Design an enzyme around this catalytic site. Structure first.
Site, short mmCIF file in Angstrom:
data_model
loop_
_atom_site.label_atom_id
_atom_site.label_comp_id
_atom_site.label_asym_id
_atom_site.label_seq_id
_atom_site.Cartn_x
_atom_site.Cartn_y
_atom_site.Cartn_z
CD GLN A 1 -14.41 17.52 14.44
OE1 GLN A 1 -15.04 16.98 15.34
NE2 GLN A 1 -14.67 18.76 14.04
NE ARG B 1 -4.31 -1.66 0.94
CZ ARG B 1 -5.57 -1.52 0.55
NH1 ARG B 1 -5.90 -0.56 -0.31
NH2 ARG B 1 -6.51 -2.33 1.01
CG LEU C 1 -9.23 10.32 0.83
CD1 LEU C 1 -7.83 10.60 0.33
CD2 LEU C 1 -9.21 10.28 2.36
CE1 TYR C 2 -7.96 10.10 7.16
CE2 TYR C 2 -10.08 10.47 8.20
CZ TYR C 2 -8.90 9.77 8.12
OH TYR C 2 -8.65 8.74 8.99
CE1 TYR D 1 -10.31 -5.18 4.71
CE2 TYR D 1 -8.12 -4.72 5.57
CZ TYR D 1 -9.08 -4.58 4.58
OH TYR D 1 -8.78 -3.82 3.47
CG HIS E 1 -9.05 18.57 12.48
ND1 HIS E 1 -9.86 19.68 12.55
CD2 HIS E 1 -9.57 17.78 11.51
CE1 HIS E 1 -10.84 19.56 11.67
NE2 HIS E 1 -10.69 18.42 11.03
N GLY F 1 -7.21 5.95 0.29
CA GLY F 1 -7.04 6.29 1.69
C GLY F 1 -6.03 5.45 2.43
CG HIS G 1 -17.74 17.40 7.14
ND1 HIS G 1 -16.91 18.05 6.26
CD2 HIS G 1 -17.28 17.71 8.39
CE1 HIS G 1 -15.99 18.73 6.94
NE2 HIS G 1 -16.19 18.54 8.23
CB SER H 1 -4.28 5.67 6.49
OG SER H 1 -5.41 6.24 5.85
C1 COH Z 1 -12.91 13.07 9.64
C2 COH Z 1 -13.80 13.50 10.52
C3 COH Z 1 -14.39 14.87 10.61
C4 COH Z 1 -15.53 15.14 11.50
C5 COH Z 1 -16.25 14.19 12.44
C6 COH Z 1 -15.81 16.58 11.31
C7 COH Z 1 -16.91 17.17 12.03
C8 COH Z 1 -17.23 18.58 11.96
C9 COH Z 1 -18.33 19.24 12.72
C10 COH Z 1 -19.19 18.77 13.85
C11 COH Z 1 -18.93 17.69 14.58
C12 COH Z 1 -18.33 20.67 12.33
C13 COH Z 1 -19.20 21.79 12.84
C14 COH Z 1 -17.25 20.76 11.32
C15 COH Z 1 -17.06 22.00 10.61
C16 COH Z 1 -15.96 22.12 9.71
N1 COH Z 1 -15.12 21.02 9.20
CO1 COH Z 1 -14.98 19.19 9.90
N2 COH Z 1 -15.06 17.24 10.23
C17 COH Z 1 -14.05 16.18 9.95
C18 COH Z 1 -13.04 16.36 8.93
C19 COH Z 1 -12.79 17.65 8.34
C20 COH Z 1 -11.58 17.83 7.50
C21 COH Z 1 -10.62 16.77 7.00
C22 COH Z 1 -11.57 19.27 7.17
C23 COH Z 1 -10.60 20.04 6.32
C24 COH Z 1 -9.74 20.78 7.36
C25 COH Z 1 -8.75 21.74 6.75
O1 COH Z 1 -7.92 22.28 7.52
O2 COH Z 1 -8.80 21.97 5.53
C26 COH Z 1 -12.75 19.83 7.85
C27 COH Z 1 -12.97 21.25 7.82
C28 COH Z 1 -14.06 21.82 8.56
C29 COH Z 1 -14.32 23.28 8.51
C30 COH Z 1 -13.50 24.35 7.82
C31 COH Z 1 -14.25 24.77 6.55
C32 COH Z 1 -13.35 24.95 5.35
O3 COH Z 1 -13.78 25.66 4.41
O4 COH Z 1 -12.23 24.39 5.31
C33 COH Z 1 -15.52 23.48 9.33
C34 COH Z 1 -16.21 24.78 9.66
N3 COH Z 1 -13.35 18.91 8.82
N4 COH Z 1 -16.66 19.46 10.91
C1 LIG Z 2 -15.32 0.68 3.80
S1 LIG Z 2 -14.32 -0.80 3.83
O1 LIG Z 2 -14.31 -1.43 2.44
O2 LIG Z 2 -14.93 -1.75 4.83
C2 LIG Z 2 -12.66 -0.41 4.30
C3 LIG Z 2 -12.38 0.62 5.19
C4 LIG Z 2 -11.06 0.89 5.55
C5 LIG Z 2 -10.03 0.13 5.00
C6 LIG Z 2 -8.58 0.36 5.35
C7 LIG Z 2 -7.85 1.60 5.50
C8 LIG Z 2 -8.36 3.06 5.37
C9 LIG Z 2 -8.03 4.00 6.35
C10 LIG Z 2 -8.47 5.33 6.24
C11 LIG Z 2 -9.25 5.72 5.15
C12 LIG Z 2 -9.58 4.79 4.17
C13 LIG Z 2 -9.14 3.46 4.28
C14 LIG Z 2 -6.54 1.21 5.81
O3 LIG Z 2 -5.46 2.07 6.06
O4 LIG Z 2 -6.46 -0.12 5.84
C15 LIG Z 2 -7.64 -0.66 5.57
C16 LIG Z 2 -10.31 -0.90 4.13
C17 LIG Z 2 -11.62 -1.17 3.77
#
Ligand code: COH
Ligand SMILES: CS(=O)(=O)c1ccc(C2=C(c3ccccc3)C(=O)OC2)cc1
Ligand code: COH
Ligand SMILES: *[C@@H]1O[C@H](CO)[C@@H](O[C@@H]2O[C@H](CO)[C@@H](O[C@H]3O[C@H](CO)[C@@H](O)[C@H](O)[C@@H]3O)[C@H](O)[C@H]2NC(C)=O)[C@H](O)[C@H]1NC(C)=O
Ligand SMILES: *[C@@H]1O[C@H](CO)[C@@H](O[C@@H]2O[C@H](CO)[C@@H](O[C@H]3O[C@H](CO)[C@@H](O)[C@H](O)[C@@H]3O)[C@H](O)[C@H]2NC(C)=O)[C@H](O)[C@H]1NC(C)=O
Ligand SMILES: CS(=O)(=O)c1ccc(C2=C(c3ccccc3)C(=O)OC2)cc1
Ligand SMILES: *[C@@H]1O[C@H](CO)[C@@H](O)[C@H](O)[C@H]1NC(C)=O
Ligand SMILES: *[C@@H]1O[C@H](CO)[C@@H](O)[C@H](O)[C@H]1NC(C)=O
Ligand SMILES: [N+]
Ligand SMILES: [N+]
Lengths: 551, 551
Positions: free
Chosen positions: A171, A88, A352-353, A323, A175, A494, A356, A498
């Protein structure tokens, strides 16, 4: 610019020769010819013997009794896990190459750490269509895409059972290396460590670190509220935080990441991880009563970094993967392998991360439902319920399905639009182009992408050509794997990002990976026996049950 | 601190357990036991089959006819050169570990690019003696060491016949990654690129680069004086230089490295490398009339980085070694091996590179002599004689011998003293401690170290114990090899740093090392055919003969 059509296949490097010709560099691609599409003989064999990623995923998620055996045969489990890591990680160039400003290798692109790097180079500036040569001269309205393909009508739960403990961990965790610098633009980051350095706990800069530290026993500053430990305030530390004006001073908790005051869920893990550092400090002081504050702090940080990678591999990703094979964090698997112990965060990794769709419509803590307006920037909720209550609640609450489309909450709609707009601003290539980049067959139609006819009709009405569809929109509406949270492309793009980022950490290198680095066997043991449950157990009152899936 | 005695052998990690106990981490050292001194079975075999370095050097500097055959067998030359690179590079930890403030693994030590790294950790603070336990309570007088041991009384020429071309190349070349930040202390550096990035041409920061660039055809600004190309002025560029107030405005040439105004010999190579850059711009414009300024510039820089590494290995180091074996720059040799494409400059690497005995008593240009009084900061000499005469004169002037002691010119006497003081200030371990760090038998007597009687006598007075001798002093008083320029320690410590520094560069990684990276086959060929002779021949009027050895 002849390279606009992305002529070079299989990682071939395109380069213009005069005004009307190009030249594909097929060096070490496994292919030859004008466009690097004719395979060499060993490539033919490999491709013939290579099962599809979805075949592999089937085998990994079935035959449980078989993996039971494998899981308890150390030599086998190790060999497999080792293969998983190298195969990978190979898909990620290291040291990094392109960024938003360079579609060709350059010293500026390599050396300037303020840029997110790039897996695929940006589309050249002078191309017929914004993606190269496919699609209309203008791209679809971003808000339209968001509205017709992403916005949530009905909540769609994660079939894999992901809970809010998982959602907020994702999240909180990402971050520390997804820290976009909007002062400069989407192409830049403030995370100059480009990985798991736990700067979201300890601060990015030494100045900020010094504000947060207690400089006694190696510990971090903290408050005691209702008998338990919480982070210190902006006032007590002078470490700046993002809070609206309504937040009273004494509720402005200060932690590593400026943005973690955003939601109570992030401040939970901030609290939990803060508790973990000071706990490891107590442990280490017993082992080393001769140690001062500095070595106690520094060693604790290294331990917590190891804990993070351990948990992320064996709880977080194992859960995601679905898995039956037990993933393993073990830097020794790679000591016999070729592997670069460094990393640079890809801008596409960031894109891709943007999971939301995980987010619920309301947050359920104990017996109370909080909407977004009630929940955002409200630290009183944290004190009101305490961390134990939070864990118990979040462990029970289901998260949303990411792939499959139409599952983004209206509250975070504009965020989803921003994710598109900034992709275009950074000149991302198409979804199909990124598919090919990670050894996936490109989709031949919209119907093939979604696995259905409704959204694929919207896509066709918006984009026209399947090769014009953009990365982020396609990722969220891609046909999910059977009863999975993601579709194929999210996984195969991903997992490489990762795993590389996790194993490409300095502590995983042989010079660092030994007991003396963490203050002896006791400290080394904290890493290698770490888990999301024991992190909660050791630091949350009552030691409640928890996991990344709902019971 | 019990680790003051440096008890852990063979790369074992010493760690305090309690107040008056310690523990060695023998992990992957090849040894076990309390002091990691008992060899494992495979280690026993390796140890007894490994020939001494002086044996190896003898074999490499003899049997000339045999090597000329080896050199013309690509299969053999490659195999040999590959082992040389891998074996010598396994002595450098990568990613790096210690620095001046951390004698234990810590994130501050790894992540902070402003520090020089350290091959050996700093002596702890509370130790019996400054070096640890050996030696007197106070180290001998710095100046007294300089006078009795290092100061020249009669110029001693290099047996290998090194010239001022070589001497100034070493100064010019190494000053891109030896940029001690004296505003902070000897433990800090300004070259955050930590290697061969040619910042001493293009400037460390984008700000400085933008002042030096022309933004036409990717070229660097320049003057034409007497019909020949010279670097631009501080006035014309706004790029600050270190010039004393006497220097007129028009003689204040501006180049990448702020300090290269110091001597005409440095400005000579600055001028030559500047001409090479704009020459490559011309070559690339013919290959790519469609390319813009930015790509022309970036690609040329990547090419010149290739040229430098090419010359340093096959001309510079080949000369130094005196090996009949023909060293080769070929990144493909390592694509099969475990190797980390990254580097971090070690303070000790910086220390051992203070080859200030190389310098003559006077500088002979054409039919004139200049002493240090009139040579320093006098670019008028450069314009007076022109570059061509400079090369003709420097090629023929012999340099001083670096090993054997008593060959530092009175002019740079203070500097030599500065070396020792900054070493102690940075808590360097003993000379014998470093010999063990690089797999050498420590010297048992002062006589064995110097292979003579007067200097070893002087040493025993100053230090007493042979284990009390410091790194810098010993390196310069060490018994040279047969008609050699260095002693064995300088080589067996120097080479690992040299080769890691060179081959660890990004362009040697398999993703970069291909023709498209350098503009095609023409661009790529410029790297792979480069030599000190052709650099001069292409950019100096008349194409004078040159070499790192005198005729
Ligand atoms: C992977 C999980 C995850 C979760 C659970 C999450 C949950 C939440 C949540 C409530 C729980 C709120 C109110 C927000 C609100 C936001 N998210 Co996230 N976000 C997450 C991954 C992201 C990622 C990745 C970015 C881009 C961040 C960056 O710095 O560009 C993001 C960027 C943001 C931004 C910046 C906006 C922009 O234009 O870049 C806001 C506002 N947020 N998100
Ligand atoms: C949605 S699924 O097909 O069950 C699946 C989910 C996660 C993985 C796997 C990820 C992964 C981690 C972060 C983002 C995306 C992938 C990894 O590093 O190994 C397996 C592999 C398969
Ligand atoms: C390898 C060749 C080489 C040569 C030919 C060379 C020739 C000369 C020379 C006359 C020709 C003069 C006047 C100097 C004078 C100096 N040398 Co060099 N030095 C060289 C390698 C070094 C290195 C290595 C350092 C350490 C620099 C750093 O940045 O830490 C050094 C540092 C210096 C300093 C730093 C001042 C301080 O630390 O207080 C001065 C002054 N110089 N040297
Ligand atoms: C990494 O690349 C960054 C973007 O190319 C670069 O930031 C840019 O730096 C330049 C020069 O420092 C800035 O230019 C401005 O600087 C002064 C301001 O007084 C003016 O004289 C200039 O005309 C111009 O206004 C750019 O604004 C800045 N761009 C961004 C987006 O930040 C970084 O410096 C690079 N990193 C390193 C370590 O060099
Ligand atoms: C890499 O390590 C360097 C050495 O520790 C460090 O430099 C130090 O930076 C701090 C700032 O955090 C300086 O602090 C000075 O200024 C503040 C201003 O308020 C004072 O409060 C402090 O007491 C102190 O006077 C240190 O002086 C400075 N030390 C040196 C020798 O330069 C770098 O910051 C580190 N790099 C990174 C990226 O963290
Ligand atoms: C003085 S000698 O024994 O002829 C000799 C000289 C140079 C080398 C060699 C060095 C070297 C370069 C700079 C500093 C120290 C070593 C190297 O990288 O390869 C060989 C090896 C031996
Ligand atoms: C914050 O939470 C508390 C309950 O702990 C609630 O009383 C308050 O209304 C919330 N804030 C907002 C703005 O809704
Ligand atoms: C600099 O060199 C010129 C000749 O090139 C000479 O006349 C002058 O005196 C020199 N400067 C000093 C300070 O000696
Ligand atoms: N499903
Ligand atoms: N000699």
């Amino acid at each position: 610019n002849p390279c606009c059509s992305h002529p070079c296949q299989n990682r071939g490097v395109c380069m213009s020769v005069g005004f009307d010709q190009y030249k594909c560099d097929c060096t070490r691609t496994g292919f030859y010819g004008e466009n690097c599409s004719t395979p060499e003989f060993l490539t033919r064999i490999k491709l013939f013997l290579k099962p599809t990623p979805n075949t592999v995923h089937y085998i990994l998620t079935h035959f449980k009794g078989f993996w039971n055996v494998v899981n308890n045969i150390p030599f086998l489990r190790n060999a497999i896990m080792s293969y998983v890591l190298t195969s990978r990680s190979h898909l990620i160039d290291s040291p990094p190459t392109y960024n938003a400003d360079y579609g060709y290798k350059s010293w500026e692109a390599f050396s300037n750490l303020s840029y997110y790097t790039r897996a695929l180079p940006p589309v050249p500036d002078d191309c017929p269509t914004p993606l190269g040569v496919k699609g209309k001269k203008q791209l679809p309205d971003s808000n339209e895409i968001v509205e017709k393909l992403l916005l949530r009508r009905k909540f769609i739960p994660d079939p894999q059972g992901s809970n809010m403990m998982f959602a907020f961990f994702a999240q909180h965790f990402t971050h520390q290396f997804f820290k976009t610098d909007h002062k400069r633009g989407p192409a830049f980051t403030n995370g100059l460590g480009h990985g798991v350095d736990l700067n979201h706990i300890y601060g990015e800069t030494l100045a900020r670190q010094r504000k947060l530290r207690l400089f006694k026993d190696g510990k971090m500053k903290y408050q005691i509220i209702d008998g338990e430990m919480y982070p210190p305030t902006v006032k007590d530390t002078q470490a700046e935080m993002i809070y609206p004006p309504q937040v009273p001073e004494h509720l402005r908790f200060a932690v590593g990441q400026e943005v973690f005051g955003l939601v109570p869920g992030l401040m939970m893990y901030a609290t939990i991880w803060l508790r973990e550092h000071n706990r490891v400090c107590d442990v280490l002081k017993q082992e080393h009563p001769e140690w001062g504050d500095e070595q106690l702090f520094q060693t604790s940080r290294l331990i917590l970094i190891g804990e993070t990678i351990k948990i992320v591999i064996e709880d977080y990703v194992n859960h995601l993967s679905g898995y039956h094979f037990k993933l393993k964090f073990d830097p020794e698997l790679l000591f016999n392998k070729q592997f670069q112990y460094q990393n640079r965060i890809a801008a596409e990794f960031n894109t891709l991360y943007h999971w939301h769709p995980l987010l619920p419509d309301t947050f359920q803590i104990h017996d109370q439902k909080y909407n977004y307006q009630q929940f955002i920037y409200n630290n009183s909720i944290l004190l009101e319920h305490g961390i134990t209550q939070f864990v118990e609640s979040f462990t029970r609450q289901i998260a949303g399905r990411v792939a499959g489309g139409r599952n983004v909450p209206p509250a975070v709609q504009k965020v989803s639009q921003a994710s598109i707009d900034q992709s275009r601003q950074m000149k991302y290539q198409s979804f199909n182009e990124y598919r090919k980049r990670f050894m996936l067959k490109p989709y031949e139609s919209f119907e093939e992408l979604t696995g259905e006819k409704e959204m694929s009709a919207e896509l066709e009405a918006l984009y026209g050509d399947i090769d014009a569809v953009e990365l982020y929109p396609a990722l969220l509406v891609e046909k999910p794997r059977p009863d999975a949270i993601f579709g194929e492309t999210m996984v195969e793009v991903g997992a490489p990002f990762s795993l590389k980022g996790l194993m490409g950490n300095v502590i995983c290198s042989p010079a660092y990976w030994k007991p003396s680095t963490f203050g002896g066997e006791v400290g080394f043991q904290i890493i290698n026996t770490a888990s999301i449950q024991s992190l909660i157990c050791n630091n949350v009152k009552g030691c409640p049950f928890t996991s990344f899936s709902v019971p």
